[PDB]
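Deviations from the work plan: none for this task. Representative record:
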Amino acid sequence: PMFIVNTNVPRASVPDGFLSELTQQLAQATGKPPQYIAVHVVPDQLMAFGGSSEPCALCSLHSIGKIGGAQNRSYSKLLCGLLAERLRISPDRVYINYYDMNAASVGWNNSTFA
Amino acid sequence: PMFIVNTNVPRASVPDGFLSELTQQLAQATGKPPQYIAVHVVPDQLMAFGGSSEPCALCSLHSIGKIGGAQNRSYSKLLCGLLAERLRISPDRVYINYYDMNAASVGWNNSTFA
Amino acid sequence: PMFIVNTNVPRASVPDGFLSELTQQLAQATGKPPQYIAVHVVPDQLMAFGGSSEPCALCSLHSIGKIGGAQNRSYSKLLCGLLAERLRISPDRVYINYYDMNAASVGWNNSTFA
């Protein structure tokens, strides 16, 4: 899975160990070994949520499988809990787009997950 | 909801108020309360459009409702005028990807819209 | 075609000519007019891959056609090749998402393709 977080929160508020924690949490959550998990955090973004520049985040989770109505509902719970606790962002100022990638459409090591 | 602009134009030339203006124009355009609208602007990006480095833009629009062939045509006129006027970007140097999102695949406030 | 590269490699390591290089080679690989291909590179990113912070890349290739099982496979060799050769990233620490874009859902110059 690939998890990306874009936020207007300044880099300095991102705690030491945040990428480590997202990896471990997401691995336990999707059931995938952590080795396949990529994490990208982008701090200091311009962005606005209701024409308001209060702390917010726009995230996305891509995965070959493990995406679904029930599943995504659990992930919002997990992910929004972390941004709240770790970065102090209100959950209702957080959007997370979920993507169910087809294996043939993910290139990895000079080829794709055929 | 969810509008992103990646551009090589300098940060110093993105007008203050650009985010609010986008917020308002999109609210009108999509008939979605401005409150549901999130906007992200990324200036100073490396990027190139047709081999060339003159100002260019790569945007994407994600909305649960309101996406579709004819509508997208209007979104393009609206978005191209805005970038051309506010950022001095030429309309032929702009791509905008449109994404109709299923409510189950969008998380907000500890849950998803399904 | 639009190609984005997100990597933790320092900006100072992106060789001059990299964007032209990618433009040239993608045009050839996809056989599409180079004047139509945008390239976006983003260095110095907070990324983790398999829990590690060693060099890695999260890329994307959006294209109206020219995308499918086999081609994605060759795009990967070519792309992972370039990245390894210029940015010294190991191909097994590179993910590339392929998005077969639907014309009508891509905006450019005040309208949409098809």
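Helices of chain A lie at 18-30, 69-87.
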